[PDB]
Amino acid sequence: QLQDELERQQLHLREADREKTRAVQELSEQNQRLLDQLSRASEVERQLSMQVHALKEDFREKN
């Protein structure tokens, strides 16, 4: 009468382990996608800042 209930808690252990694995993997994938997008944005900011600096120098010269 209690042995089956212990089996239920074993089932809950397996269920929670599976759910935790799914959730942590999903969060890791979201994290890595956002890191890739962060790198892309940082690269864009870098090139555009380079263009800003070059343009300012050109504008001093042409002024």
Add this chain to the structure above:
Amino acid sequence: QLQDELERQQLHLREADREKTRAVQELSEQNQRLLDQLSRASEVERQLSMQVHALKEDFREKN
């Protein structure tokens, strides 16, 4: 004996939930921080982009 392992399995389910909660919270905070960093990168991208666009407009106009 059934009580001994049953209570332990209950409290160990709770303990595994504690680690799950900690991991989910940490990954959620990292996700939020990376979302904020990407939003700030987008903001700096947009400011530098209106800068460079106005700068190229100025270049073509003073040219």
Add this chain to the structure above:
Amino acid sequence: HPMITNVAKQCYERGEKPKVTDFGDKVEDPTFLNQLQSGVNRWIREIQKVTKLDRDPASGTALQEISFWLNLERALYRIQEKRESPEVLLTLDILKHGKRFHATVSFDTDTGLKQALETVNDYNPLMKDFPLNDLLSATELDKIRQALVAIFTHLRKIRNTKYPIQRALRLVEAISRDLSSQLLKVLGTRKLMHVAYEEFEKVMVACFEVFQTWDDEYEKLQVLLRDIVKRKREENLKMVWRINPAHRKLQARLDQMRKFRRQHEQLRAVIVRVLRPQVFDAADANAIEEVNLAYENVKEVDGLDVSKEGTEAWEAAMKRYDERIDRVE
């Protein structure tokens, strides 16, 4: 150089190891020193041809990977044994005595032999035993699963080596490619199209057991790799996996197969129950033969073809069968 050989055989025949002094006036000879210098340049270039070898992880099978790494290790050990031979040491000693430190310093440094030797020594325990050969030999799904667990344990061996995490991952897609090849070979051999539906379901249950074992053991190794990266958190920064196992498509392909035939079989049973009159309308036999013809038409397209041509032929077959079943629906 012939001269070092002649002096060395002379010294050994006199029961004594050779020395720089035995060359006498030859030690200060310019041309002899230049010849030894050019010889050491040749030695360094030849050694750099072997030490600097690198293999693209993505290309080729993991069997080719293990062969490459062991062959390189054996080559480096042979080169090291040659390097410690008395001839090369004598040549370096002569060049030092002539103050020609270019060649000696370059040989001690430019070869990179120590670094490659350390690398292969680190990589040996991970490649010492791998069962991929046995897996490629194995012809049964349960044997395949046993091979997978063996492979993933010999991959768990990585923790006490310096193998890069990225290259280990590329090895894992190599495992995936081999697994897909062997599964395709087995399922082609048994001709799953024409067999009884029940044993067919049993075999696909075995296949999905194999896929689940792959996923579970990959997850175990994945947490292990994340722990390893934590242990070396300052050294390596690139944790990005983006793993795309080759068999994954095939898994999805096989997944389609199951649901397809399952729906078909269930639907087939149901229509056979319903169309029977309360004992024979021609429309009933028309519908039944239409369902059977739809199955036979789908059987025309091979189920195991995963390529783009396979994908498009499969899609055409599914649209055809869908319309044919939409009639009876």
